[PDB]
């Protein structure tokens, strides 16, 4: 009953290992494109 | 021929900006998300399978 319960519940590792450096890299790429984003409308003020 | 009531090449080249600032929105979008089909409008057949 033990390794029947153990099947249900428990929590591998490796998997999790994995989703929280695919989720960090994205997030550090996001923050970097949105920078770059926000710094797209300065141009504007020269053509004045 | 010096024309002032109208300027042409004005529109001409503001026609060029409007056509590159839509390659630059496509590009952004998908470093953003990290997919390239994020809509119907990409690839019909391809959201599908």
């Not at chain 1, 994205?26 to 409308?41: D, H, Y």
């Not at chain 2, 979008?29 to 391809?46: C, E, F, T």
């Amino acid at each position: 009953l033990s390794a029947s319960r153990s099947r249900i519940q428990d929590a591998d590792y490796a998997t999790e290992v994995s989703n929280m450096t695919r989720a960090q890299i994205l997030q550090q790429a996001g923050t970097s494109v949105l920078a770059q984003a926000n710094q797209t409308t300065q141009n504007v003020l020269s053509l004045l | 021929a010096q024309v002032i009531n109208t300027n042409s090449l004005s529109l001409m080249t503001q026609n060029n900006l409007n056509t590159s600032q839509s390659a630059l929105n496509t590009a952004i979008q998908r470093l953003s998300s990290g997919l390239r089909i994020n809509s119907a409008k990409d690839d019909a057949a391809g959201q599908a399978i």
